[PDB]
Design a protein around this ligand. Structure first.
Ligand SMILES: *[C@H](CC(=O)NCCn1ccc2ncnc(Nc3ccc(Oc4cccc(C(F)(F)F)c4)c(Cl)c3)c21)CN(C)C
Length: 308
């Protein structure tokens, strides 16, 4: 393993300005804001998480471990952590992704989402995951809820709360126990708590299924405890109505019990790119041709153009 020379930037609180609330969770509130590094004549749209005063030492540690992972990744299809701020509670500053999570996006915009967007998103997520594989990172929580939308044309993988860096000689991560996203997990993760890049491929297949059904819940109504035996009997998620057999076969291959029989991310990039070149041959969507989606503010620059 090579040295990790990623830079962690510690921002001062007077450099960023909270504009409005975007969300509230167990761990603190998220604000829309601007990051205005002193004397640089640039304003960067950001989301700012300010942790709650009541957050435990254990929670703080876990959040900082997630920041470490996010600071260590740099790819157009993976979320961008700008830095953290050590005020009385920790604040985290990330690139603003104004269209929210992809799961919610596809549910809310399903009558205007055409085949080109769906296939491009699959390509993009596969590129991000391929990059994480190159970095020897196993995500362990890939799902449409954990993909952010910068613009309808550009998505990025997020939520590194479960991510693990494999050791140099290590091929599998062995987990301890807790509350796990069963319906996205590879069979070997459910049974034996084993995670690899190939178990992430399984989750990728489920993520694709979520997109192609415009945000349906996988195995809806089936309790999580029944999933493993359903899988062991050879049953899988059904073929979405818009999917040609070409697309469904790819998902099916992601859900092979033999981990080595599943596609690799680099191959998923290739197969979805082929399809993205002639999208209406691969996804059959009523009204496809018709569909369109969105495409002081002086000195504003996106985080992706503010390089270190
Ligand atoms: C869908 C995502 C969504 O819309 N969430 C609301 C907040 N929001 C709106 C736009 C936007 N852009 C960018 N980021 C966020 N939120 C956000 C999440 C996490 C975060 O920083 C961290 C980093 C590491 C760990 C944590 C945590 F403490 F563990 F939570 C937080 C920041 Cl700064 C911002 C945005 C959600 N859908 C319900 C699934």
């Amino acid at each position: 393993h090579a040295p990790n020379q990623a830079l962690l930037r510690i921002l001062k609180e007077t450099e960023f300005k909270k504009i409005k609330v975007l969300g509230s969770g167990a761990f603190g509130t998220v604000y829309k804001g601007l990051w205005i590094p002193e004397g640089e004549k640039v304003k960067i749209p950001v989301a700012i998480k300010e942790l709650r005063e009541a957050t435990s030492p254990k929670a703080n540690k876990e959040i900082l471990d997630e920041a470490y992972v996010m600071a260590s990744v740099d790819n157009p299809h993976v979320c961008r952590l700008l830095g953290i701020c050590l005020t009385s509670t920790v604040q985290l500053i990330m690139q603003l992704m104004p269209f929210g999570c992809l799961l919610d996006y596809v549910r809310e915009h399903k009558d205007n989402i055409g085949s080109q967007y769906l296939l491009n998103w699959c390509v993009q997520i596969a590129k991000g995951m391929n990059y994480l594989e190159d970095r020897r990172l196993v995500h362990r929580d890939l799902a449409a809820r954990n993909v952010l939308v910068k613009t309808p044309q550009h998505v990025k993988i997020t939520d590194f709360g479960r991510a693990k860096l494999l050791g140099a000689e290590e091929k599998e991560y062995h987990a301890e126990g807790g509350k796990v996203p069963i319906k996205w997990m590879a069979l070997e993760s459910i049974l034996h708590r084993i995670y690899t890049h190939q178990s992430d491929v399984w989750s990728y297949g489920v993520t694709v299924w979520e997109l192609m059904t415009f945000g349906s819940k996988p195995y809806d109504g089936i309790p999580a405890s029944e999933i493993s035996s359903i899988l062991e009997k050879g049953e899988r998620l059904p073929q979405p109505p818009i999917c040609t057999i070409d697309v469904y076969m790819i998902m099916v291959k992601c859900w092979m019990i033999d981990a080595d029989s599943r596609p690799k991310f680099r191959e998923l990039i290739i197969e979805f790119s082929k399809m993205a070149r002639d999208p209406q041959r691969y996804l059959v969507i009523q009204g496809d041709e018709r569909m369109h989606l969105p495409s002081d503010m002086d000195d504003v620059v996106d985080a992706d153009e503010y390089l270190i």
